[PDB]
């Protein structure tokens, strides 16, 4: 623990500064440090954790695709070697995040909003592994993503309203999992449509602030349906 000697509150303060500086690698290390303090995370802290690693892994995924595309076109070892380098570092980030979730974020998360959040993240990071998987564990990696998403979905449906932004973001990502990872485009479409319609019918219950939060994610579901249909 590089961050073992820094106060929890200082690590959270520094994560927030790192976000402002666009130093996402630092933001992610600071939030890793905070989780390793062993206390549960607040809503805000969960969002810091997620944003930090999304940003880190986002850069690696983007780099991977560029390198993978060049490699495909090329089909010397250099292209493959460098795509492998980036891929390995990507897998490491996913491994680290899954690490934090299993030791011990998920088992201590009893509230719907925390448990759903973490299980969604678990699905997400298995999905990122799945995006680069080519060998004898691909099927199991994919099934790990499905399993995580499905538990999250079951909890979300039982414990949260249809407009709950966490529930909506989960359905969005599970929908993309179906479309592109499980090669189940009809499932992806059905999930996205059903999720949008059930959210639309519940907007009447919300404040203006909540309405804004929900409709933002509903538009993402719409954006995908437009490309898909």
């Amino acid at each position: 623990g590089a961050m073992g000697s820094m106060e929890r509150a200082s690590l959270i303060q520094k994560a927030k500064l790192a976000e402002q500086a666009e130093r996402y690698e630092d933001m992610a290390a600071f939030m890793k440090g905070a989780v390793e303090k062993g206390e549960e995370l607040s809503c805000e802290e969960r969002n810091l954790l997620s944003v930090a690693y999304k940003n880190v892994v986002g850069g690696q995924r983007a780099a991977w695709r560029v390198l993978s595309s060049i490699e495909q076109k090329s089909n010397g070892p250099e292209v493959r070697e460098y795509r492998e380098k980036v891929e390995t570092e990507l897998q490491g980030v996913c491994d680290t995040v899954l690490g934090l979730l299993d030791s011990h974020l998920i088992k201590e998360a009893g509230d719907a909003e925390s448990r759903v959040f973490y299980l969604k993240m678990k699905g997400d990071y298995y999905r990122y592994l799945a995006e680069v998987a080519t060998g004898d564990d691909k099927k199991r990696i994919i099934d790990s993503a499905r399993s995580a998403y499905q538990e999250a979905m079951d909890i979300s449906k039982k414990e949260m309203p249809p407009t709950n932004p966490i529930r909506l973001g989960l359905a969005l990502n599970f929908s993309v999992f179906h479309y592109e990872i499980a090669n189940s485009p009809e499932e992806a479409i059905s999930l996205a449509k059903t999720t949008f319609d059930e959210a639309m019918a519940d907007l009447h219950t919300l404040s203006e602030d909540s309405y804004k939060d929900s409709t933002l994610i509903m538009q993402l579901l719409r954006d995908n349906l437009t490309l898909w249909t």
Binding site: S50, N55, I217
Partner: peptide, 12 residues
């Protein structure tokens, strides 16, 4: 690759 909308920062 065409990337679909997923939750949170469009960091890729």
């Amino acid at each position: 690759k065409l990337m679909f909308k997923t939750e949170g920062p469009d960091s890729d």
